[PDB]
Amino acid sequence: GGYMLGS
Amino acid sequence: GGYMLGS
Amino acid sequence: GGYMLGS
Amino acid sequence: GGYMLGS
Amino acid sequence: GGYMLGS
């Protein structure tokens, strides 16, 4: 899997 | 803001 | 994998 | 692929 | 300001 975070 | 992506 | 971070 | 935009 | 990413 993996991940993505943002603002 | 900003961002972070990873696997 | 790998990673990417930015602002 | 894709796109990410933030402001 | 902000950010734009595409792949």
Add this chain to the structure above:
Amino acid sequence: GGYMLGS
């Protein structure tokens, strides 16, 4: 490939 822009 792709692109990344920030300001």
Add this chain to the structure above:
Amino acid sequence: GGYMLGS
């Protein structure tokens, strides 16, 4: 892909 920005 690619991008275009203008004012």
Add this chain to the structure above:
Amino acid sequence: GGYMLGS
């Protein structure tokens, strides 16, 4: 896909 924004 893609995107278009304008004012």
Add this chain to the structure above:
Amino acid sequence: GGYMLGS
């Protein structure tokens, strides 16, 4: 494999 993030 996997990922671990903390802040």
Add this chain to the structure above:
Amino acid sequence: GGYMLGS
């Protein structure tokens, strides 16, 4: 292999 980042 892999990666480790800290700040």
